[PDB]
A paper describes a structure:
To gain insights into the molecular mechanisms that govern the metalloreductase activity of STEAP proteins, we determine structures of human [name] using single-particle cryo-EM. The trimeric structures reveal an aligned, inter-subunit NADPH-FAD-heme arrangement and suggest that chelated iron(III) binds in a cavity of basic residues to facilitate reduction. Our biochemical and structural characterization of human [name] elucidated that detergent-solubilized [name] forms trimers that exhibit ferric-reductase activity in the presence of its redox cofactors, FAD and heme, and electron donor, NADPH, indicating that the enzyme does not require specific accessory proteins for catalysis. The trimeric arrangement observed in the cryo-EM structures is formed by interactions in STEAP protomers in both the OxRD and TMD layers, with a phospholipid molecule packed in between the TMDs of adjacent enzyme subunits, indicating that lipids stabilize the trimer.
Author numbering:
A (entry chain A), B (entry chain B), C (entry chain C): 19 to 454
Amino acid sequence: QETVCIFGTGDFGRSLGLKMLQCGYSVVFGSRNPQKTTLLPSGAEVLSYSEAAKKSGIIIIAIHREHYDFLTELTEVLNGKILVDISNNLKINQYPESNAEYLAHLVPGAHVVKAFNTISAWALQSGALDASRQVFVCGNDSKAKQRVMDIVRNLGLTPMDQGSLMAAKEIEKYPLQLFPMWRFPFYLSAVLCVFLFFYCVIRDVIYPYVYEKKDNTFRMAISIPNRIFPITALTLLALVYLPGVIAAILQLYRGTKYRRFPDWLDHWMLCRKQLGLVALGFAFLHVLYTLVIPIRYYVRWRLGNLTVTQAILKKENPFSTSSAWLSDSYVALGILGFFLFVLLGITSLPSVSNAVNWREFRFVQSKLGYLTLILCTAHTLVYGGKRFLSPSNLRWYLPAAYVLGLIIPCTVLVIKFVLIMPCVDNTLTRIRQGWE
Amino acid sequence: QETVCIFGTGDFGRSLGLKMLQCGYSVVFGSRNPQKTTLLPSGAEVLSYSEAAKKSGIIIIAIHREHYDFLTELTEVLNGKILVDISNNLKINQYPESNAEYLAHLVPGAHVVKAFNTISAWALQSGALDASRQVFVCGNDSKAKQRVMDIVRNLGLTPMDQGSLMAAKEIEKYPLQLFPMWRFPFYLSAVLCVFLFFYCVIRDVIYPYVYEKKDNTFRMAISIPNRIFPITALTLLALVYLPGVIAAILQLYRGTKYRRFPDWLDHWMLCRKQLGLVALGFAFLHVLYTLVIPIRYYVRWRLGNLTVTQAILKKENPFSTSSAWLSDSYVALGILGFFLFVLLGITSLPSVSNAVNWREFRFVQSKLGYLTLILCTAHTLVYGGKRFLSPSNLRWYLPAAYVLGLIIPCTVLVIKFVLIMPCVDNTLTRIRQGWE
Amino acid sequence: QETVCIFGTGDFGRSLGLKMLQCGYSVVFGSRNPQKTTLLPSGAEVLSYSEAAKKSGIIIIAIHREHYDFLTELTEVLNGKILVDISNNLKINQYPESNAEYLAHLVPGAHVVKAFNTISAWALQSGALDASRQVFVCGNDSKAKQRVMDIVRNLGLTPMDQGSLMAAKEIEKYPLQLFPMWRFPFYLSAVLCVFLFFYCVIRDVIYPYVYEKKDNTFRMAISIPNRIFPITALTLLALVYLPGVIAAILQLYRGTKYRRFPDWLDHWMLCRKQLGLVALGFAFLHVLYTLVIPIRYYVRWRLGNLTVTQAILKKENPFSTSSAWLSDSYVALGILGFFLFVLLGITSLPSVSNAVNWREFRFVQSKLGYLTLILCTAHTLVYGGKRFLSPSNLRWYLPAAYVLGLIIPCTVLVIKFVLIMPCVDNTLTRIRQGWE
Ligand SMILES: Cc1cc2nc3c(=O)[nH]c(=O)nc-3n(C[C@H](O)[C@H](O)[C@H](O)COP(=O)(O)OP(=O)(O)OC[C@H]3O[C@@H](n4cnc5c(N)ncnc54)[C@H](O)[C@@H]3O)c2cc1C
Ligand SMILES: Cc1cc2nc3c(=O)[nH]c(=O)nc-3n(C[C@H](O)[C@H](O)[C@H](O)COP(=O)(O)OP(=O)(O)OC[C@H]3O[C@@H](n4cnc5c(N)ncnc54)[C@H](O)[C@@H]3O)c2cc1C
Ligand SMILES: Cc1cc2nc3c(=O)[nH]c(=O)nc-3n(C[C@H](O)[C@H](O)[C@H](O)COP(=O)(O)OP(=O)(O)OC[C@H]3O[C@@H](n4cnc5c(N)ncnc54)[C@H](O)[C@@H]3O)c2cc1C
Ligand SMILES: NC(=O)c1ccc[n+]([C@@H]2O[C@H](COP(=O)([O-])OP(=O)(O)OC[C@H]3O[C@@H](n4cnc5c(N)ncnc54)[C@H](OP(=O)(O)O)[C@@H]3O)[C@@H](O)[C@H]2O)c1
Ligand SMILES: NC(=O)c1ccc[n+]([C@@H]2O[C@H](COP(=O)([O-])OP(=O)(O)OC[C@H]3O[C@@H](n4cnc5c(N)ncnc54)[C@H](OP(=O)(O)O)[C@@H]3O)[C@@H](O)[C@H]2O)c1
Ligand SMILES: NC(=O)c1ccc[n+]([C@@H]2O[C@H](COP(=O)([O-])OP(=O)(O)OC[C@H]3O[C@@H](n4cnc5c(N)ncnc54)[C@H](OP(=O)(O)O)[C@@H]3O)[C@@H](O)[C@H]2O)c1
Ligand code: HEM
Ligand code: HEM
Ligand code: HEM
Ligand SMILES: CCCCCC(=O)OC[C@H](COP(=O)(O)O)OC(=O)CCCCC
Ligand SMILES: CCCCCC(=O)OC[C@H](COP(=O)(O)O)OC(=O)CCCCC
Ligand SMILES: CCCCCC(=O)OC[C@H](COP(=O)(O)O)OC(=O)CCCCC
Ligand SMILES: *[C@@H]1O[C@H](CO)[C@@H](O)[C@H](O)[C@H]1NC(C)=O
Ligand SMILES: *[C@@H]1O[C@H](CO)[C@@H](O)[C@H](O)[C@H]1NC(C)=O
Ligand SMILES: *[C@@H]1O[C@H](CO)[C@@H](O)[C@H](O)[C@H]1NC(C)=O
C-alpha cells in the first residue's frame, strides 16, 4: 500500500486526505503543530514537516504561495521527492512567475508536478464532482509525472496531461476566469439592446401618446422585445462574418499572408464563436415570441375587432394574392434561415467539433454560414417590402427601426460578392500559398 | 508480428479473434477439444490450453467465472504471462469479490488486466461500434497495462485507463445497469403524473358531467396533458434546489461542515442532475402543447362562436388594457423562464461540462438556477392573477389544480431569501472554511 | 532546450516553425538553398539537408510524396532518427501504400511516426484551431512515439494515439473526405424530395388551374414544403428500421449468424445513423412550418371568410365532438412522436453516446425507436381518418399524396409484429448464441 504525505492540514488537506483514506493510501499529514490537530480523519497520523517527509515519496503542498518560506529549511530532506504544487492565486497576473516555477527554484533537488488546482474541496467531500472532473497535470520529469497520474485515476477523476512545466502559467489562469471570451459579446449586445430599446419606445409608446393620444404602453412586454431581439440577433450575426471580409481585403493591400493582423482584429478573430452563440440566443427568443403571437390578448382582440367590423359593414377582403406570397415568403425564408442557424450551433459543441475534420467544418461554418446570413437578410427584406419604405412610415424624422439593422449585413453581402468574383478570387487562391 | 492467445472459443472468442485476423495478430485459440472446432476463422489454429499458452505472451480468457477451475491445473505455465480478464456477471453483487480479484488469487504468478468487458461481440462482428467505443482498462502492473492498451488502439477502439485493480469492482457494475440514477426521478414523476391526471379529470370532465351535463371529454387529449406536464415540470424543478436549501440549514444546526449528511439527503444530492433533465423534458412538452394551441379544433371553434356572438349582438369588447398587460406578462415571463431552462440543459452535456471550470459552472447552475425558478414561478403567479383565487373557482371543495403545485416552489423561494440575508449569509461564509 | 529540425521551408514549414519559436524549441530549417530563404522567422537558422539533420533528433518532413527521392542520398545520416511524416495526398487511393509505409522502406534505419497531417497551416498561424484540435499519431516504435506526443502537447494541441503503423492508411483518408457517409441519405432524400414536389404540384396548383380555374399558386411557399418534408421525414425514418427487419429475417433462412450479410445491406447497416439524423432535420422543419400556420395570410384570410359567412348566414356549427377527438388526437400523437424523435437525436451526440453502455443505448435506440415509429405512423393515420380515403379525394387517378408514404412504415410494423411473436422470437433467442 502506498504512502502519500500532505503538507498543510487546512481546507483542502482535510478533504483530499479523507478521499484517500477511502481509496487506500497511507496518508501522513504534516502541520505546524502535531500536538493539536482537532479535525482529522481516523486512520491518518499527523507528524512534523521534517518527520512526515521522511516517509512518503509523494508530497502534496496544500499551502498558499506566501507561506513557502519554511521549505528552504528542509531542502536536504526533499532530495528526489515528487512535489505536487496545487496552489492558486487570488487574481490573474499577481506574480511574474507561476507557483510551480517559483516552487522549483526554492527546491531544485525535487521534481515539481502541477496538479489538482482545478477541483474544489467541497466537490471532494460531497462527491458531486461535476464540473471538477478533469485534473490538469504538467511537469518536466515524465516518470514522476506518470506516478501522479496513477493517483488521480484512483480518486475517480480524469487526468489530462498538459505537457512541460511551461504550461503551468496557463493552468493557473484557468480556474480564476469567469467567461473571459464572452465579455466582448455581452457588452456589445447590451449596448445594442439598451439603445434599440429606447429607440423603439420613442416610436411605439411615445408617438401614440403625442398624437392620437392613447395608452398603448403594453408594447414593451412582448412587441418591443420582439423588435430588439432579432435585430440584435441579425447584427451580431453580421458581425461574425465581418472580420472574414476585412482580413480578406487586408491580405490584398499587403499582398502576402505572413504579416500579423493589427491586434484589434485579432481578438475579434478569436471572438467569432463567442458572438455566434450569442446571436443564437437572441434568435431563439425571436422564435419563441413569434410562435406565441396567436395567444396574446392584443392579437386576439385586434382579430376580433377587424372581423366584426367586416361583419357589420358588408364590405369584404378580396384575397389579394400578392400579399399571399409575401406573408408566406419571409416566414419560409425565416424557417430555413433558422434551421441552419441551429445547425451551426450543434456544430459548435466541443464533442461534435472534435469528430469533424476542418474541411467539413469549413463547409458548415463558412459555406453554409453565409447561406444563413442570406436567408436571415431576405427574411427582413421581404418583411420590409410590406412596409415598402414609404414617407408615411417614419414618425418624426426616424425610420421603422429595422432598417438601422440592415446597414451591417448588406455591407457584408456586397463586399463578399466582390470577393467571389474571379478577378479577385483567383488572386485569393495564389495568395493562400505564397505571393509577392 | 505479435501472437495473441484466446482461451474459450465461444461467442466472444470467435468475434474477438476474427477482428484480430483483420488487424494482423497471430491468433492462437485454445479450447477443450482441438479436434472438433467447426466455426473458426481461416488463419488461426486451435490448440490445447497447455499448448496455446506456450506461444503467446498475452492470454485472453473468454470464459465465465464458474469455469475458472482448470486454470489451477496449469499455473506453472502462466508464470509471468499477461492475463486479460474480460468476464461479466449475471447481476450486481453476485459475489463478494470481482472477477479480476478472484482471478489473481487463482494464478498469483501472472499479471491481471481487466479489459474488454464493456463492448459486445455483435458490435465487433457488425462493426457498428457506436456506444461500445471506449474500453476500460485497470490493473496493477503498469508495463503490462500499456501492452494491452497497444492492442486496443489497433482494434479501432479507445482505451480509457481506470487506475489500479481496486477499480475492477466498479467496472463490472458498469455494463449491467440500465439507468441507475434515473430510477428516482422516473418513479417520482410517474406517481405525480398519475395523481395529477386523476385530479384534473375530476375537475374537467366529471364536473361538466354532473352539472350542466355535456360531454366535454376531449380535454384529456391535449388540455389535461397541458396541465399535468408543467406542474410536473415545476415541482421537479423546485425539488432540485430543495436539498441545497435543506443542507444549508442543516449546516447551521451543526455549526460545521465536517459531519456527514444523513444518507437520505445524500442520494438526493446525487440525483440533482437526474431531476433537472426530467424537468426539462416536461417543460419542453408544455412548450409544444402551448405553441400548437391555435391549431386545435376546440380553439378554432370557440374563437368562432365568441366572434359571431359579438357579431350578431352589437355589443363589443372595450379592450381592457389591464388584461393586455397580464396576457402579455406571463408569456414573456415564460419565454425568459424557458430560455434559461434550456441553457441549464446545454450546460449539462458531458462535453460542455468538461470545458468549464467550477466557478462558471456554479454561476450557471446556481446563480442562474434560481433565476429560472423565479421566472417559472412568476409565469404561473401572473396566470394565477387572471383566476384571482376566487370562491367561484373550486368545483366541489378543491382548487384550480395549479396552486397545489405552488406549495413547493414558494417554500424554497422564501427560505432561500432568508439565506441571502446578511444576518445568516455572513455566518454561511465563515462556516464554509471552518467554524465551531 | 530541445532542437527540432524541419525539412522543407514551404507553406507548412514556416507555420509549424513559427509556432515552435513561440513554444521554446531550437528550430533548424533545412531547404534546398540555405543562401536564399526570404520568408523565415527570427530565431531559426536555415542549413543544408545533410547539415540540419546532424543537429536534432526529431526530423519533420514537410514535403510532398513525389519529392522523397533525395532522402536515399542521406540515409546514413538518418540512422536512429525520429522521422515525422506529415504528408497528405491529392485524392483517395492514389497509391497502393500510404506515405509512412513508403517512407519507412526508403529509410529503414529510422523510426517513422505519422502525425500532424490533420491540422492546417492557417490554423497554426491564426491560432483559430477549432476543428483542427486533435492530432492523430501512429507508429511502431513506442518510445519514439511518446517523444512526438511530448511535442504536440506543447503546441496546445491534443494527441490521439492510433496504434501501430498499419493504421496510417486510414489516417490519410481522414482529412480528404467531405461527409462520406452522408452521401447516401442526401441523394436518397433529394430524389424523394424532388419526386414528391412534382407530385404535389400536380395535385395542388395544376388541378385548380384545369378545373375551377383560379391561381392558387402560392401553395409551393409553405404548404407544399409542409407536405414534402414530413413524408420525407417519415419514409427516411422507416428506412432506418428496415435493415433491422430484413437481417432478422435473413438470419432465419440461414439458421445461423456467422455468415456475412450481402454487402449491399452492409453499407445500409452503417448508414443507419446517417439516415436518422437526416430524418430529424426534415421533421424539425415539419414542426416549424406547422407551428407558424396561424401567422400565414392564407390561414388568416380563410378563417375570416368562414366566420363572416357564418356571421351573415345565421346557420352555425353544432360542435361535432367526434371531430374534437381527431383534431386533438393526431396532434397529441405528433408531439409524443416528436419528443422521442428529439431524444434519439440527443443520444446521437458523440459525447452522450460515450457515456452510456450498450444496453441502455439499445433501449433508447431500439426499444424506444419503434415507439417513435408507431406514434409517427399514428400521427398520419388519424389525420388520414379525416380524409377517410374516399373516392371524392383523388384528383385524376392519383391519391392524396401521403398514402404513398405509408407503404414503407406499415410494412415494417407488420413484419416487426411477426418477429415479436413467440413462435419466432424464441427462435431468435437461441440463434443469437449459436444454432444450426
Ligand atoms: C451559431 C454560430 C456558431 C459558430 N461557431 C463557431 C465555432 O465553434 N468556432 C469558430 O471558429 N467559429 C464559429 N462561428 C463563427 C464562424 O463560423 C466562423 O467565421 C467560421 O469558423 C469561419 O468563417 P469565415 O468566413 O471567417 O471563414 P475563414 O476561413 O475563417 O475566413 C476567411 C478568411 O480567412 C483567411 N483564411 C482562411 N483559410 C485560409 C488559408 N488556408 N490560408 C490563408 N488564409 C486563409 C483568409 O483571409 C480568408 O479570406 C460560429 C458562428 C455562428 C453564427
Ligand atoms: C436543467 C438542469 C440541469 C442540471 N444539470 C446539472 C448537472 O449537470 N450537474 C449537477 O450537479 N446539477 C445539475 N442540476 C442541478 C442544479 O444545477 C444543482 O443544484 C447545481 O449544481 C448547484 O445548485 P445548488 O443551489 O444546490 O448549489 P450548491 O452549491 O450545490 O448548494 C448550495 C449548498 O452547498 C453547500 N456548499 C456549496 N459549496 C460549498 C463550499 N465551497 N463549501 C461548503 N459547502 C458548500 C452549502 O451547504 C451550500 O448552502 C441541474 C438542474 C437543472 C434544472
Ligand atoms: C434520430 C435517430 C438517431 C439515430 N442515431 C443512431 C446512432 O447514433 N447510432 C446508430 O447506430 N444508429 C442510430 N440510429 C439508427 C437506429 O437507432 C438503429 O437501428 C439502432 O442503433 C438499432 O436499431 P435496430 O432495430 O436495428 O436494432 P439492432 O439490434 O441493431 O437490430 C436488430 C437485429 O440486429 C441483430 N442483432 C442485434 N443484436 C444482436 C446480437 N446480440 N446477436 C446477434 N444478432 C444481433 C439481429 O439480426 C437483430 O434482429 C438513429 C436513428 C434515428 C431515427
Ligand atoms: N476550495 C479550496 O479552498 C481550494 C481548492 C483547491 C486548491 N486550493 C489551494 O489550497 C491551498 C490552501 O488553501 P486552503 O483553501 O486549503 O486554506 P488553508 O489550508 O486552511 O490555509 C493555508 C494552510 O497553510 C498552513 N500553514 C502553515 N504555515 C502557515 C502560516 N504561517 N500561515 C498560514 N497558514 C499556514 C496552515 O495549516 P498548518 O499550519 O497546520 O500547516 C493553513 O491551513 C491554496 O493554495 C489553494 O489555492 C484551495
Ligand atoms: N456479447 C457477449 O456475449 C459478451 C460480451 C463481452 C464479454 N462477454 C463475456 O465472455 C465470456 C464468455 O461468455 P460468452 O458469451 O462468449 O459465451 P461462450 O464463450 O460461448 O461460453 C463460455 C465458454 O466457455 C468454454 N468452456 C470451457 N470449459 C467449459 C465448461 N466446462 N463449461 C462451459 N463452457 C466451457 C466454452 O468453450 P470451449 O469449451 O471450447 O473452451 C464456452 O464457449 C463471459 O464472461 C462474458 O461476460 C460476453
Ligand atoms: N495547409 C497545408 O498546406 C498543409 C497542411 C498540413 C500538411 N500539409 C502537407 O505539407 C506538405 C508540404 O506541402 P505544402 O502545402 O506545405 O507546400 P510547400 O511546402 O510550399 O511545397 C513543398 C516543398 O517541398 C520543398 N522542396 C524540396 N525539393 C523540392 C522539389 N524538387 N520540388 C518541389 N518542392 C521541393 C520545397 O521547399 P524547399 O525547396 O526549400 O526545400 C517546397 O516548399 C504536403 O505533404 C502537405 O500534405 C500541408
Ligand atoms: C422561426 C423562424 C422565424 C419566424 C417565424 C420569424 C417570423 C418573423 C415575423 C413574423 C416577423 C415580423 C414580426 C412583426 O410583425 O413585428 C419577424 C421579424 C423579424 N425577424 Fe424573424 N422570424 C424567424 C426567424 C428569424 C431569424 C432566424 C432572424 C435572423 C436572426 C430573424 C430576423 C428578423 C428580423 C430582423 C425581423 C424584423 C424585426 C422588426 O422589424 O421588428 N427572424 N420575424
Ligand atoms: C415557451 C414558454 C412558455 C409559454 C408560452 C407558456 C405558456 C403558458 C400558457 C399559455 C399557460 C396557460 C395554459 C392554459 O391556458 O391552460 C401556461 C401555464 C403554465 N405554465 Fe407555462 N409557458 C411556458 C413555459 C413554462 C415554463 C418554463 C414553466 C415552468 C416549468 C411553465 C409552467 C407553467 C405552469 C405551471 C402553468 C400552469 C398550468 C395550469 O394551471 O394548467 N411554463 N403556460
Ligand atoms: C410538433 C409535432 C407535430 C405536429 C404539431 C404535427 C402537426 C401536423 C399537422 C397539423 C399536419 C397536417 C398538416 C396539414 O393540415 O396539411 C401534419 C401532417 C403530417 N405530419 Fe405532422 N406534426 C408533428 C410531428 C410530426 C412528426 C414527428 C412526423 C413524423 C415524421 C409527422 C409526420 C406528418 C405527416 C407524414 C403528415 C402528413 C403530411 C401531409 O399529408 O400533407 N409529423 N402534422
Ligand atoms: C450566459 C451564457 C453562458 C453560456 C455558456 C456556454 O454555453 O458556453 C460554455 C462553453 C464555451 O466555452 P469556451 O469554448 O471556452 O469559450 O461551451 C461551448 O462551447 C458552447 C457550446 C454550446 C452550443 C449550443
Ligand atoms: C428516458 C430518458 C433517457 C435519457 C438518457 C440521457 O439523455 O442521459 C444519458 C446521460 C446521463 O447519464 P449519467 O450522467 O451517467 O447519469 O447523458 C447526460 O448526461 C444527459 C445529457 C443530456 C442533456 C441534454
Ligand atoms: C448538412 C448536414 C451536416 C451535418 C453534420 C453533422 O452534424 O454531423 C457531424 C458528425 C457526424 O459525423 P460521423 O459520426 O463521422 O458520421 O457528428 C454527429 O455525430 C452528429 C451529431 C448531431 C446530433 C444532433
Ligand atoms: C375597433 O377599434 C377602433 C379603434 O381602432 C374603435 O374605435 C372601435 O370601437 C373598435 N370596434 C369595436 C370595438 O367593435
Ligand atoms: C369566400 O370565398 C368564396 C370562394 O371560396 C368567395 O366566392 C366569397 O366571396 C368569399 N366570401 C367573402 C369574401 O365574404
Ligand atoms: C355558442 O356556444 C353556446 C354554448 O356555450 C351555444 O349554446 C351557442 O349555440 C353557440 N353559438 C353558436 C353556435 O352560434
